[PDB]
Amino acid sequence: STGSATTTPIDSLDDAYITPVQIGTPAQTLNLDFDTGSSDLWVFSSETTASEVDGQTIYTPSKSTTAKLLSGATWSISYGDGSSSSGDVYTDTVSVGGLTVTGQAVESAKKVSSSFTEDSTIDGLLGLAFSTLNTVSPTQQKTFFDNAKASLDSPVFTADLGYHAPGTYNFGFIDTTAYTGSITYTAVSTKQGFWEWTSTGYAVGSGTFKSTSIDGIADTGTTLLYLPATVVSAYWAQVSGAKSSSSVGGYVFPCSATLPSFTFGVGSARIVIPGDYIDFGPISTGSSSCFGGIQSSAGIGINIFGDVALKAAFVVFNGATTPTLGFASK
Ligand SMILES: CC(=O)N[C@H](CCc1ccccc1)C(=O)O
């Protein structure tokens, strides 16, 4: 089997992407944030505290003839950005782009933090990291991809995120028309539960490529590119007037600047992020200071190849016994 679904930016900045997901019988379609940095499929629901729902579409398990309470199971998650959610668990039928999994754990939110409430466009998350990170207790649950893997034509999914445009998530096949040149497969460590890999270096604009091992995660659920402070300083030094601000909380540059590209290495291959992808526009409405798309990871503990990086590539996630990541230009 295979599946194919369009993923759409939630706003004009590509802050996140939503993909429609069918849950239950009859189907209830919710727009979920596919997140290769986490491993829970959780949704706003009829159980979510009413004051914490503000425009999201909710899953109502009592209206699904295939829903079953997973007795005793609870979940609770905290994300790298400080947001969080928690609740109980049902199993139900879940379909993405024509690919159906029966018995998928659907984590129903009883509580969500304010950042989720305040974002009316995201109805929940669909985690695509390794199932060892799933938070369901006392019996950890499998991700949608892990449940589908055995049925797929090939045990892979691909992320093809658009710049200011829709893109595609495919399951079970590699669309050879969706990229240019060849795909580069790099080794993955699953020791932390992430799609963790090692980049062979970087360049700023037309500058020389610096060969250096940069170990990070491929994370579709993170907006920006977070890299070591040395790398980030080298990038922003090429933008007149750019500075790191303590009050704002990262690098900012004049909104009148033209940004240089940023290249990252995947083996001997190179992925080029155009300068425009690094512009996250005014810090506040009407401001002439713009917020940068490449930021320091120094306070995170891990480097993160988020959407800024991934949208410049066609990315293959391989869930076979030897995992690997693939990157192609497009
Ligand atoms: C970029 C690079 O060095 N790739 C190699 C092979 C990556 C690989 C591993 C297994 C099967 C196919 C491909 C590596 O990371 O070890």
β-bridge mates for residue 139, sequence order: none
Burial environment of residue 201 by CB neighbours within 10 A (0 to 12, 13 to 18, 19 or more): middle
Query: Closest by alpha carbon to 280, among 305, 255, 247, 309?
Result: 255
CA separation for the pair 121, 212 (Å, rounded): 39
Sketch the domain layout of the chain as residue ranges. 5-174, 175-330
Q: Which amino acid is at 305?
A: F
Does 5-174 match 175-330 in CATH topology?
yes
Interior angle at CA 281, CA 315 and CA 220, nearest 5: 20
- CA of 218: how far to CAs of 78, 162, 200, 239, 280, in Å? 19, 16, 15, 26, 20
189 lines ligand 1 (CB under 6 A): no
Please give the structure tokens belonging to residue 97: 């782009």
Pick the atom of ligand 1 nearest to 200's CA. Answer: 1
In CATH, 5-174 is 3.40.50.300:
no
Residues 239 and 74: their CA atoms lie apart, in Å, by 48
Determine the distance separating the centroid of ligand 1 and the alpha carbon of 189, expressed in angstroms: 11
- Binding site membership of 182 for ligand 1 (Cβ less than 6 Å): no
Query: Residue 173 is which amino acid?
Result: F
Q: Rounded to 5 degrees, what are φ and ψ at 307?
A: -55, -40
Pocket probe for ligand 1: among 174, 186, 268, the residue whose CB has the most ligand atoms within 8 Å is 186
Q: Which of 199, 261, 296, 297 is catalytic?
A: 199
Across 289-307, b (16+ Cβ under 10 Å) vs e yields bbbbbbbbbeeeeebbbbb
| Whether residue 198 has its Cβ less than 6 Å from ligand 1 | no
Q: How close is the Cα of 78 to the center of ligand 1, in Å?
A: 32
CA of 186 to the centre of ligand 1 (A): 4
- Pocket flag, ligand 1, residue 329 (CB < 6 Å): no
For the range 179-183, what are the long-range contacts, defined as Cβ-Cβ under 8 Å and sequence gap of 24 or more?
179/313, 179/314, 179/328, 179/329, 179/330, 180/328, 180/329, 180/330, 181/328, 181/329, 182/269, 182/328, 183/314, 183/316, 183/326, 183/327, 183/328
The amino acid at residue 147 is: N
Contact in structure between 314 and 328 (CB atoms under 8 Å) = yes
Residues 6+ apart with CB under 8 A from 132: 39, 140, 190, 193
Alpha carbon of 267 to ligand 1 centroid (Å): 9
Q: Which of 35, 40, 123, 146 is catalytic?
A: 35
- Asked if 35 is an active-site residue, the reply is yes
Q: What is the dihedral of CA 138, 139, 143, 146, to 10 degrees?
A: 160
CATH H-level, domain 175-330: superfamily: Acid Proteases (2.40.70.10)
Closest CA to 209 of 231, 176, 224, 233: 231
Tokens of 212: 């250096």
Q: Give which of 322, 319, 323, 327 is closest to 154, Cα–Cα.
A: 319
Integer CA distances (angstroms), 148 to 4, 94, 95, 176, 275, in order: 13, 10, 10, 22, 37
Closest CA to 313 of 205, 124, 159: 159
Q: Hey, what's the torsion of the CAs at 22, 23, 28, 31, to 10 degrees?
A: -60
Q: How far is the CA of 175 from the centre of ligand 1 (A)?
A: 20
Q: Is 213 in the pocket of ligand 1 (CB under 6 A)?
A: no
Q: Indicate whether residue 79 lines ligand 1 (CB < 6 A).
A: no
- Which residue lies with its CA nearest to atom 12 of ligand 1? 185
Q: Please give, one letter per residue, the 3-state secondary structure of the chain.
A: CCEEEEEEECCCCCCCEEEEEEECCCCEEEEEEEECCCCCEEECECCCCHHHCCCCCCECHHHCCCCEEEEEEEEEEECCCCCEEEEEEEEEEEEECCEEEEEEEEEEEEEECHHHHCCCCCCEEEECCCHHHCCCECCCCCCHHHHHHHHCCCCEEEEECCCCCCEEEEECCCCCCCCCCCCEEEECECCCCCCEEEEEEEEECCCCCEEEEEEEEECCCCCCEEECHHHHHHHHCCCCCCEEECCCCEEEEECCCCCCCEEEEECCEEEEECHHHHEEEECCCCCCEEEECEEECCCCCCEEECHHHHCCCEEEEECCCCCEEEEECC
Cα(141) to centroid(ligand 1), Å: 29
Pairwise CA distance, residues 237 & 220, whole Å: 27
Which residue has 């590539």 as its token pair? 313
Q: How far apart are CA 279 and CA 193, in angstroms?
A: 30
The number of C-alpha atoms within 13 Å of 149 and in the hemisphere containing its C-beta is 16
> Distances from the Cα of 108 to the Cαs of 87, 147, 321, in angstroms?
6, 18, 31
Q: Closest Cα partner for 192 from 282, 251, 233, 132?
A: 132
Q: Which residue has the tokens 């997901």?
A: 21
Alpha-carbon distances of 214 from 30, 175, 301, 327, rounded to whole Å:
36, 28, 13, 16
In sequence order, which residues have a C-beta less than 8 Å from that of residue 177 and are 6 or more positions away? none
